[PDB]
Amino acid sequence: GGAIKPDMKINLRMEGNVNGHHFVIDGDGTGKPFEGKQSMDLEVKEGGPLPFAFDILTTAF
Amino acid sequence: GGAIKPDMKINLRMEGNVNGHHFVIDGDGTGKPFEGKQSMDLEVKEGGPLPFAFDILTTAF
Amino acid sequence: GGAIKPDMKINLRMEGNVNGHHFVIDGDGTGKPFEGKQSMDLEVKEGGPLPFAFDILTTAF
Amino acid sequence: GGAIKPDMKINLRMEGNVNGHHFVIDGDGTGKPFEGKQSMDLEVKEGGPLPFAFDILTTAF
Amino acid sequence: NRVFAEYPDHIQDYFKQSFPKGYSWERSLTFEDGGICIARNDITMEGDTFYNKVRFHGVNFPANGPVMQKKTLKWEPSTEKMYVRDGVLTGDITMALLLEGNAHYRCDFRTTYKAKEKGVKLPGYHFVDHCIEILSHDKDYNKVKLYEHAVAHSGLPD
Amino acid sequence: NRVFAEYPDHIQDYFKQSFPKGYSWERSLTFEDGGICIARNDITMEGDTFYNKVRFHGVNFPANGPVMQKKTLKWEPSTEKMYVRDGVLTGDITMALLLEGNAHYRCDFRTTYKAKEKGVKLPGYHFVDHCIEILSHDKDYNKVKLYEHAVAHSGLPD
Amino acid sequence: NRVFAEYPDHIQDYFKQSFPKGYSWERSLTFEDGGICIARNDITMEGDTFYNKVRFHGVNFPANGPVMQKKTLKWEPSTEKMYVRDGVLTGDITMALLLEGNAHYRCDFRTTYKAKEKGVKLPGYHFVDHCIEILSHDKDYNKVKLYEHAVAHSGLPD
Amino acid sequence: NRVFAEYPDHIQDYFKQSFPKGYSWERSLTFEDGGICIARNDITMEGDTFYNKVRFHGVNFPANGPVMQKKTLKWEPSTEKMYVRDGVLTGDITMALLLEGNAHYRCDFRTTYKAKEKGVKLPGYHFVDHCIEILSHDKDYNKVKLYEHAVAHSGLPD
Numbered sequence: 084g085g086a087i088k089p090d091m092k093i094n095l096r097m098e099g100n101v102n103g104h105h106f107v108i109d110g111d112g113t114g115k116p117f118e119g120k121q122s123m124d125l126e127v128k129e130g131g132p133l134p135f136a137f138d139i140l141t142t143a144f
Numbered sequence: 145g146g147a148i149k150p151d152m153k154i155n156l157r158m159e160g161n162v163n164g165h166h167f168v169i170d171g172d173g174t175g176k177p178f179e180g181k182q183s184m185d186l187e188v189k190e191g192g193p194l195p196f197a198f199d200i201l202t203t204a205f
Numbered sequence: 206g207g208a209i210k211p212d213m214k215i216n217l218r219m220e221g222n223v224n225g226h227h228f229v230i231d232g233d234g235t236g237k238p239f240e241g242k243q244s245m246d247l248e249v250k251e252g253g254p255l256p257f258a259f260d261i262l263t264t265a266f
Numbered sequence: 267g268g269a270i271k272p273d274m275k276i277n278l279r280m281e282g283n284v285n286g287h288h289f290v291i292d293g294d295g296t297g298k299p300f301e302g303k304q305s306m307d308l309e310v311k312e313g314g315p316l317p318f319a320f321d322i323l324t325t326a327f
Numbered sequence: 328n329r330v331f332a333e334y335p336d337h338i339q340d341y342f343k344q345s346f347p348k349g350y351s352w353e354r355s356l357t358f359e360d361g362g363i364c365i366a367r368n369d370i371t372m373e374g375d376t377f378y379n380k381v382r383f384h385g386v387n388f389p390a391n392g393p394v395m396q397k398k399t400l401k402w403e404p405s406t407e408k409m410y411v412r413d414g415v416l417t418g419d420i421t422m423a424l425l426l427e428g429n430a431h432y433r434c435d436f437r438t439t440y441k442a443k444e445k446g447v448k449l450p451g452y453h454f455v456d457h458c459i460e461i462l463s464h465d466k467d468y469n470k471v472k473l474y475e476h477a478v479a480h481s482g483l484p485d
Numbered sequence: 486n487r488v489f490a491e492y493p494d495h496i497q498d499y500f501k502q503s504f505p506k507g508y509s510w511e512r513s514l515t516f517e518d519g520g521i522c523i524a525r526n527d528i529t530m531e532g533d534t535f536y537n538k539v540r541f542h543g544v545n546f547p548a549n550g551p552v553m554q555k556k557t558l559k560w561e562p563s564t565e566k567m568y569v570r571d572g573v574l575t576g577d578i579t580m581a582l583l584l585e586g587n588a589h590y591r592c593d594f595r596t597t598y599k600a601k602e603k604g605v606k607l608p609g610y611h612f613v614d615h616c617i618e619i620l621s622h623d624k625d626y627n628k629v630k631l632y633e634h635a636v637a638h639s640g641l642p643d
Numbered sequence: 644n645r646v647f648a649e650y651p652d653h654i655q656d657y658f659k660q661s662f663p664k665g666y667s668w669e670r671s672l673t674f675e676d677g678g679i680c681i682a683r684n685d686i687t688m689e690g691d692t693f694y695n696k697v698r699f700h701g702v703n704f705p706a707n708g709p710v711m712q713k714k715t716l717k718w719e720p721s722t723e724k725m726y727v728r729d730g731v732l733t734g735d736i737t738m739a740l741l742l743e744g745n746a747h748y749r750c751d752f753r754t755t756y757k758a759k760e761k762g763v764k765l766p767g768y769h770f771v772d773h774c775i776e777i778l779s780h781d782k783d784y785n786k787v788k789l790y791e792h793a794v795a796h797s798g799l800p801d
Numbered sequence: 802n803r804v805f806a807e808y809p810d811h812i813q814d815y816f817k818q819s820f821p822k823g824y825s826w827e828r829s830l831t832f833e834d835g836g837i838c839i840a841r842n843d844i845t846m847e848g849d850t851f852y853n854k855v856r857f858h859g860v861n862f863p864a865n866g867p868v869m870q871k872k873t874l875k876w877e878p879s880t881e882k883m884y885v886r887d888g889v890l891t892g893d894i895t896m897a898l899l900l901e902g903n904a905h906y907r908c909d910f911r912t913t914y915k916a917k918e919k920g921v922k923l924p925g926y927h928f929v930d931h932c933i934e935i936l937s938h939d940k941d942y943n944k945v946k947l948y949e950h951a952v953a954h955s956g957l958p959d
Contacts, residue, residue, distance in 0.1 A: 315783030482562030720956030
């Protein structure tokens with residue numbers, strides 16, 4: 084490897100709009116790139132409670 | 145036009161299968177090509193009564 | 206009509222991102238709703254010159 | 267399993283039409299259902315040589 | 328048979344110009360719930376009579392969808408978009424079957440038209456308004472009287 | 486803004502009936518080569534002026550496709566099909582961009598229209614012919630003059 | 644014939660459970676350039692032999708497309724997603740043909756599988772990895788030796 | 802972030818080779834009922850941290866569909882097909898959402914991946930198995946703990 088470490092932190096911010104509903108979600112997590120695994124804690128900063136299935140957003144984090 | 149007459153006859157035979165259901169339909173009609181109008185009498189020969197909406201077939205006659 | 210006048214003005218602002226390219230476009234126009242016609246002058250405020258066909262945006266104004 | 271044997275023979279006949287071209291293909295092969303493997307010798311009986319890529323038909327045998 | 332469509336002088340009529348030799352068309356009907364059909368018609372002409380050899384095949388319609396449950400009432404009138412794709416005259420349509428409850432069921436049509444004769448002059452982008460309807464039918468649709476009215480045009484503003 | 490469309494008396498005009506409060510629309514533009522755009526407009530009114538807050542996003546356009554390569558000439562005129570889906574007015578269109586070279590590039594439009602206020606009757610199935618044109622523009626399209634003419638109708642035979 | 648697929652003990656094997664009575668399947672093949680195929684196969688069994696009655700119809704393939712011009716090399720291996728839709732076992736696959744030139748040509752697969760004898764237990768959501776290849780063939784493909792290897796599984800993590 | 806995927810030595814790892822500069826992806830999520838979403842993520846890195854700037858837009862979801870009615874349970878595990886399209890790394894997937902009632906809601910994914918730095922070698926056709934899960938969440942999903950496990954491979958028979 085090198086540039087990428089076996090253990091990485093993850094910083095994230097998602098802003099969006101679904102069927103007219105605006106929202107902002109912050110994310111903080113960690114992962115193991117060479118093991119192909121990651122986890123993150125997400126928090127809806129704006130737009131909560133989301134009026135749609137949270138699942139549609141998951142693969143975008 | 146010449147080649148195509150103002151009044152034309154129409155003969156037809158359709159054969160097919162939808163969702164596994166086989167059918168054969170005969171058709172006899174007339175029309176006015178330059179007026180963009182036609183009419184046809186249809187007769188289901190095999191597979192009747194059709195177990196599916198007859199409408200899906202209409203634009204194919 | 207009542208609520209809508211035969212001659213109406215149009216104010217518009219578009220913001221977006223296409224293939225990674227950000228842009229902002231302002232619009233000022235007029236239209237005759239009962240006649241089904243409208244025209245507008247658009248000006249790219251940010252992101253110009255656009256690296257993609259302007260035609261994809263037109264129906265969104 | 268009982269019903270299905272470790273080694274099975276396969277017989278097949280395909281009839282079709284692609285872009286107006288009619289064809290008939292006979293098939294004779296063998297396979298191991300529990301090992302998820304099969305093979306077959308195909309022979310175009312009518313419409314040969316096919317004027318389109320043989321590959322579009324393969325998964326239908 | 329697009330031959331039965333009123334074509335204005337300013338639009339090339341590919342269909343009437345395809346006879347007496349004739350032509351054939353192929354079509355794909357992609358319904359919104361996964362149902363997919365394909366059809367083809369080889370059209371010939373003998374005297375004052377058109378002959379039609381039609382084949383229609385459909386698969387994957389949901390067991391409880393409006394097609395297998397016969398819940399359609401009719402096709403809504405439509406506007407077909409005609410244009411040339413890779414040298415072949417093509418028609419794409421946003422079709423819709425009216426269902427009970429005043430609801431609709433969408434189907435996307437793509438038809439390719441090919442004159443038996445090579446070189447038939449191809450038209451430019453244009454439209455063909457359609458209206459097909461079952462004028463009458465017996466209980467289980469074993470006997471049906473069909474009708475269609477079609478008109479070609481250049482769209483707005485023309 | 487479908488407010489700018491000539492609606493006949495026998496067809497419910499959802500858009501003109503949506504004011505003074507206004508309405509919003511969302512649209513998906515699915516281009517045949519994989520490019521996909523999503524657009525939305527919140528439309529309001531004050532005095533004799535319509536205010537439009539628009540957002541437009543697109544992804545997956547091929548690097549060498551007609552969009553990223555700026556090879557389009559114009560949208561062809563079109564006919565939008567209006568109907569209701571799950572209580573929401575929807576418009577599906579078979580759109581096409583004319584390209585340099587006499588070829589076309591297809592795009593499927595689906596627009597959902599929603600009145601801001603209650604009390605707006607949903608229209609029955611109908612059509613809206615369209616014609617949008619860029620009347621003029623400078624070299625880089627930083628300045629463009631746009632135009633659109635639209636007319637609602639009931640198709641054939643009407 | 645999905646009977647030829649290695650099924651693990653933890654996953655219901657709908658196909659092997661459909662015999663000796665047998666089963667049938669329908670499939671729609673939607674290629675990215677508009678070409679569309681619909682096929683079906685009625686599978687029965689007697690003794691140590693599987694009998695197949697197959698039909699294959701295709702339309703709208705572009706004249707100069709990889710299919711009509713015979714520029715395909717093979718299907719890439721794939722993973723079919725098996726699930727139940729309206730009481731019917733369905734398989735959707737993201738398929739791809741490698742073409743001469745190293746480019747790929749996409750095709751979307753949807754197959755519905757139905758046992759002839761009612762009462763056959765439907766399986767839960769699962770996967771079937773495939774790899775089909777033409778081992779040999781004469782110049783005009785009038786004679787072709789085909790081979791396939793398929794393995795069912797539950798995906799990650801198991 | 803496809804960087805979080807176990808790549809075998811025999812397959813080119815476009816994502817890990819994209820750093821320190823990074824890469825970005827765009828995606829279209831086409832659901833079977835007309836709902837459509839577009840998303841993009843610009844990924845950079847510094848020290849031991851990946852920074853993600855994400856945008857997500859969705860339109861045309863039926864008012865009473867599983868999405869607006871919150872009737873989904875999870876995404877089923879999947880297998881993404883990775884290949885090059887017109888010089889761009891692309892991933893197509895047959896995705897499915899498990900719904901209450903045990904039916905599945907299909908969504909077709911197409912993601913394009915682009916390295917910031919030029920010259921990053923593109924990989925050949927391969928696969929990436931996925932399994933994403935919401936490990937836990939509070940009542941209204943204002944707080945969610947997500948997890949994903951991904952492994953790349955060459956399919957059968959390897």
